[PDB]
């Protein structure tokens, strides 16, 4: 049984699902059909990292459509949607992801996806979170300095240095050998992405990457556009909370923060927006929010949303002061959002699963959610599968690109041309009957593009 | 055993979520606090049917609170939350209520809260759609004229008919008896007002009663915000779809479609309404929703959503015009707003529970939510408890009302008093952190109101 | 010359506007249509006190082709537009109105609106603010006892019991003689409904009165509709202010105050409303505004706005705290809702027609818009066209029905019919492509209403 | 008389709208601050052609409190408020610019900016459309290749060209000699930016220039936000028309076409969108506008905006197919949008100023804004100066650091640097109460960015 999942019987559900999505996810649907042929994607053996979810096994079917061979874990340890996993199991693809697996589990999980049999190994990583990228970094250079995973700060460092140590007892040179014929990788997330121009700029990427998110396609639909339909839906899937009326502050307004508020907003919430950056302050003011410090809003909202990438936006003092059933929750890629770790120490009642009152010693409880992991993806299903096909179709190119042409490509983090970047918009457009218009030849003279695009120049924001 | 629930288990679950909700429904805690001195409703018997949610264990606590004796039905199939029914059992309510109860089910259940132990006999109906004050009246007709119960026309009539006909040989005189000790019914909804005032204009209501609906703070509330943060979620949980760029119809633009409209577009869905009344029509177009009819809407609309209160709004041959997986739900309180029955004889197949595929000769498939059962309470839980709070301050009030006084009213349906309406909004306002202003003397004499209120004239709309 | 505008030559550009407004006001060129034939208006006398607009020009000529002879005054001091006045003068109407008209200049054309010549009197009143009615009710009550002119309490009033002097010592019977031949009257907004509803209360209404504010189609769209686009548009003529970042305080939350809220929103300001009626505020309170009070506002907010039809809602200390250079306007009916006389013992500055510098003692400036007069009619042009079709068409059917038949009328206030309420809006259903279904058979007798309506109990609230 | 404007009384008027604007516009006003000691500007000789409004006007007074002389035109026709010309003038800058001024007019005062007395040269230019740069490098052109200069397409060419020509005759050297001088160029608009790269791209391009546009803080405020605001406000003011209910077609959906959709949209249109960009296109499906196109639009809609800065996206075809009453107006950078030209065949009928009736054959009008002049500015007075300031602010950093440094620039189009984006941001927070919240230490080193910024990589949307 080359697999981990929680129920293989949850397949047929599953498929009723996926076939759905199909209909929903254009983009993937006609990337299949476009390269069938030509099967781009033989050879390439595929180590995924990556919420296991409907939306997933559409891209994994993709992937292989095209000719891959893939195995999978989840990125995060309360994403994967376990009717999802069973029916791509089904199908024959090895998935190592349920709802609800432990950190150790987590990180196992991993190592399963680049342990491939018959002596092969995989030669691509497609990763959110950059978490199957930095295992295999990490490995390689705990081969040479153990030191590297000696001093765990947290109990995800505990868990992945712990799996470090067990996977080099067993063979010196597990992660440096695997290491070696990862062609390259793509990488889905601003969190992931983060991590890759860290390495860009220390000179210790090795081997190609391409930045999915940052897609025009990506990063200002699926982070956006999906947000604001998913934040909200996972808070009431946890809570049922009405949303009218409260005071909502979300912290961040980035793309995530954006798509957070603005659903927040549509529904009647007052909201508050945080941000280090002016910038998006002021865009966060120009709407309507008011533009306030945790500080000052700890003690009077209703809902605490993180939306920021960074660490301890919402801390243990923040948490002290919040009125009594405050809704506490994240929406980065990272829980460190929120220092849960620091309200161990208090009773916790637990209310369901993903949902837990926290008790503090004069009796005010804060309800927080999924453990601070990401909340959408924790008590919800994520973006609905539309917007995903955006971020999926920029994958499977990515991944295309990679394979195909990886030799034409330096040890950098890259972007996919705007040229492809519009091909994923305009595959989504007939789903929902847009009509796209032509320039004349006069007009494409007078604005100096081709009537076939790129329509922007490569600085154009959107 | 005086009960009949899914899962007693349940009940610590349902308990932690009636203590959040507590802290939701300021006016249900305000009113308990402010009445249990002088139990109003000590000698009570109230038998309700209505959708057994957490938000209803509030309710009928806060009814044993007052002094009542409470038995309790839902008033839908699949609107229990069997968590909620558990806690509430647990706490000594006999409960007649589970999600997916059959439609016999159903009715035995509607007979149950009317089957009181020791020879006493309900003198209180809290209904919500009119059921249980329908079953009543209904039998004792059957009792002198069987032919009233000869001639189903649908499934609810074979179910209902045949509990009747099962009771009825057990006691000829099993309804009559029951109503002569009925001192009034307090009516939740748009449909069972409608049936009170139905009776009124024929001279066959045989007690007061209470019009719930009407009140400004339920009908304005309720109806409209509550639907504005349900409907999606009802049809989310069901189908996980996108909303942004959808082409989504809502039938009827009442306070209930107002609601549903306001959340589509919330999200970036097209929003179509369709309408009978110009007025509304109007309202509709003055939002920058088209209004079009189901006939032009059929063959082009992504998501259906009936919100009138009426027959057959969506029809066989419109299911018939559909695209492939257009979903297709009612939020009305009666699932015949959709002619679910006219397309039993294509082959289905259940997706998940709520959530079927209708397989139409040439392959289309429509994506029917809760067999057209109401959405919100089906796929979801219903409104949020906030709002709830308001509708069920007011039935509380009602009830309170025609029990300590109802031999002041006449056999008429009635509105609680603008003054109560304005308290029930009153009690909301602390929650959320609205401060109320103050008329000055001079002001209150120049508008012509007291500083106390009641603030506007009775013809006014809000 | 019976007339007295600005400027003659001012008409073809009026006549030009009247031509295009005619094409957005449906409801107004349909019952010219439809009753053309009959000349309902045939001997009627209208004197009309009603904002000079092109819009009220359009009413004038409806009134006209069906047959009234009609003269004309405006309601505000401010609210005329001199290109309307002209082309109605031009075209045959006397009418005496021109923006800017000193008080006593206004009270004078409320006399004059009533002299008709070769014997001849009013018959009836179509009145927006109630001010020609208080003219002859006031006028004639003086005739007899001086002591209800003697008591003026600010400006207006000071000129309107200078003006009903002047005219008594002409003639001692000059208001009861012309009050005797007014059949009926129709009045328009809130402001003057009040002043019918206290009138009828005190037992001193001489005439049938209808109370065309309370159609469904009048206050539900004219008030919330037309101030949703005519308030924003006012204080931009006057100040060109960006709306986008500012705290925008709402005095009142009625249907102008709802409309005013929901401009200033969408253009992302933070709104705060105001109220001193619970239900009203938590309306506001589920749209995410704030509900503050104005002593908390006043020296935070950047733009306020009454909208209550109340006394001294800003006062002189509110305008002290408040910060330089914030903007404060008023939309009710009457200049009351701010103290501007408070702010008279200061230096003002003059910026240009309508808009005013306050300067206090500290040097700080507050920017008055209009002197506190209605901020939409004042500094721009009220509301636009198509919403008023539907106050106007209402304004047409009170008029026919009170000529036509008022002797069936008592001397109490009535509202129109619901069937003419939904015909009103059926007309306008047109020109914007709204299409309107229609009930079946079954669907008629399934919720007990008519095909042709009306289709909603006369106490819905829309 | 070294200035040409309208009315040099209107003076007073002016300055007290620039004393307001002034606290509208807090990053000019700490600009002045920072740098008034340092005199950076002292020595620059500052051409410009930008709208001659109000808060040019904050921006020539801050020029010139940094010590640069200036003389000014406007860079459009019909944009120029004649109370800040006159206001500017009567301070000590040369002002040539009316609102209505032909475009011989126009041609000449783009000239006189670029003749200073005793000798002297501009050595910078500052604009807005790419005129003033565009007069001296064609012009230049023009001295030795008269050809450059045969072939006027359109009445401002003609113009164009005649001047050229008319001052080639005094001087064959009036251009080159001239051009030499211009140390470097700030341009503002995506238009006058486009036509910079365009000139880079050819080698034609003869000192720096800085593109203020794709500042951060410029295309994402004042594109966006200011449309969003003035676009109606211009409309509003030209026809008075309702929003509410109408269908409005946005051709493009850049940061104008955005601005513009979402201000329709809020007033309860029905808003359709045009483009050619797939990407755009999505985004704007996502909002739920439809995507269709001119040609569909043509005849269904109520009000048409061109938003692309392209050419001929309403032509003479569109508009014969128009209904009756049609408002058709431009809010990009020149006319030529709509094909005005093509409709000069027809009988016109002037409405009133910028306010048009085209009359067709079958008696059809359209009713064209402005003869398609940018809308907002040519019927109202454009973004309003809170916003504006971003932009203004970005112009004079961009001014100070060419002057200053212009030296270590390549004759290249470049973007001002993240650092400076974000301090035009953070100038404006204040204003608006928005709280910006600061990194720590561990926060700032997690994401890798300095706590005194820059946040964000420079490939960065927002
Ligand atoms: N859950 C999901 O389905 C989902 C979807 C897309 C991306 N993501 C993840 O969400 C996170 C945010 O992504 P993004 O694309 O919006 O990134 P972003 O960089 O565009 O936005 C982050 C914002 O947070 C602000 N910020 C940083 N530290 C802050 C602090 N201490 N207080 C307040 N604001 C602070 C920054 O100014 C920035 O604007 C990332 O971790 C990303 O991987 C999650
Ligand atoms: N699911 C929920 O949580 C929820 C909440 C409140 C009320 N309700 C129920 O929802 C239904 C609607 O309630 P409401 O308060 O909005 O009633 P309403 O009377 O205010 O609105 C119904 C609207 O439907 C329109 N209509 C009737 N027949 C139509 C047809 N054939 N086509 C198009 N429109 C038609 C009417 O013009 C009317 O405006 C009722 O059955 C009510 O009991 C449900
Ligand atoms: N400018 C226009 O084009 C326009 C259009 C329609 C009506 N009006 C006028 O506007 C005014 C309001 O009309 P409406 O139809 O909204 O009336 P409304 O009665 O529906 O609303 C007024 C609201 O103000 C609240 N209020 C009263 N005093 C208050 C105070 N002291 N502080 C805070 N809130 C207070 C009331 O509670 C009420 O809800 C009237 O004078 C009416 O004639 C103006
Ligand atoms: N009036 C103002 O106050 C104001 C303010 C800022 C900019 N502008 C001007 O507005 C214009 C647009 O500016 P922007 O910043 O939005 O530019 P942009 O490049 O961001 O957007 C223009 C959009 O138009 C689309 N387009 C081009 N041709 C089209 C056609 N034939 N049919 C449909 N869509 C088409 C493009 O695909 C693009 O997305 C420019 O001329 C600019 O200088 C005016
Ligand atoms: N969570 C909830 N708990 C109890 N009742 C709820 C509910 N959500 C909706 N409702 C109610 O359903 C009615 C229509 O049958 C409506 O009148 C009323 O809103």
Redo the contacts between chains.
């Keep these: 049984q080359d697999y981990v999942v929680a129920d293989i019987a949850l397949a047929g559900?599953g498929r009723?699902?996926l076939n759905?999505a199909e209909?929903?996810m254009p983009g993937l649907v006609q990337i299949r059909d476009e390269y069938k042929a030509q099967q781009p994607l033989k050879g390439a053996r595929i180590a995924g990292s990556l919420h296991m979810t409907?939306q997933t096994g559409v891209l994994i079917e993709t992937l292989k459509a095209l000719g891959a061979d893939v195995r999978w874990a989840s990125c995060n340890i309360f994403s994967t949607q376990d009717h999802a996993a069973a029916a791509i199991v089904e199908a024959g693809t090895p998935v190592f992801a349920f709802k609800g697996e432990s950190l150790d589990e987590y990180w196992e999980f991993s190592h399963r996806i680049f342990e491939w049999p018959n002596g092969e190994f995989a030669n691509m990583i497609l990763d959110d979170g950059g978490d199957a990228t930095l295992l295999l970094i990490l490995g390689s250079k705990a081969e040479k300095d153990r030191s590297v995973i000696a001093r765990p700060t947290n109990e995800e460092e505990v868990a992945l240095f712990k799996s470090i140590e067990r996977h080099l007892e067993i063979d010196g040179s597990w992660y440096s050998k695997r290491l070696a014929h990862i062609k390259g990788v793509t990488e889905e997330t601003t969190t992931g992405v983060?991590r890759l121009?860290?390495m860009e700029?220390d000179g210790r990427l090795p081997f190609p990457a391409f930045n999915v998110n940052?897609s025009?396609?990506k990063?200002?639909?699926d982070n956006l556009?999906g947000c604001?339909?998913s934040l909200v839906?996972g808070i009431?899937?946890a809570?049922?909370?009405?949303?009218?009326?409260?005071?909502a502050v979300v912290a961040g307004y980035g793309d995530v923060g954006k798509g957070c508020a603005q659903?927040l907003?549509?529904?009647?919430?007052?909201?508050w927006v945080?941000?280090?950056?002016?910038?998006?302050?002021?865009?966060?003011?120009?709407?309507?929010?008011?533009?306030?410090?945790?500080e000052?809003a700890a003690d009077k909202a209703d809902i605490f949303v993180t939306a920021t990438?960074?660490?301890?936006v919402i801390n243990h003092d923040h948490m002290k002061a919040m009125r009594?059933?405050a809704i506490v929750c994240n929406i980065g890629h990272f829980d460190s959002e929120i220092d849960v770790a620091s309200t161990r120490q208090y009773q916790w009642?637990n209310?369901?699963p993903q949902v837990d009152?926290i008790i503090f010693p004069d009796g005010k409880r804060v309800?927080l959610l999924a453990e601070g992991r990401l909340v959408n993806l924790g008590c919800?299903?994520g973006?609905?599968?539309?917007?995903m096909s955006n971020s999926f179709t920029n994958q499977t190119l990515a991944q295309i690109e990679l394979f195909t042409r990886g030799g034409e490509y330096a040890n950098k983090v890259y972007?996919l041309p705007k040229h492809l970047?519009?091909?994923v918009?305009?595959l989504?457009?007939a789903?929902?009957?847009?009509?796209?218009?032509?320039?004349?030849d006069?007009?494409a003279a007078?604005?100096?593009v081709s009537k076939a695009?790129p329509?922007?120049?490569d600085?154009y924001?959107?």
């Design positions: 559900w009723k699902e759905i209909t929903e409907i983060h121009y860290q700029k940052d025009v396609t990063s200002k639909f556009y604001r339909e839906d009431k899937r809570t049922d909370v009405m949303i009218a009326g409260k005071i659903s907003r549509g529904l009647g919430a007052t909201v945080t941000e280090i950056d002016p910038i998006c302050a002021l865009q966060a003011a120009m709407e309507g929010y008011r533009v306030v410090t945790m000052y990438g960074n660490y301890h009594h059933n009642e209310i369901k009152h309800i919800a299903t973006h609905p599968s539309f917007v972007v970047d519009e091909k918009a305009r989504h457009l789903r929902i009957g847009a009509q796209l218009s032509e320039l004349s006069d007009q007078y604005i100096g695009g329509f922007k120049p600085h924001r959107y």
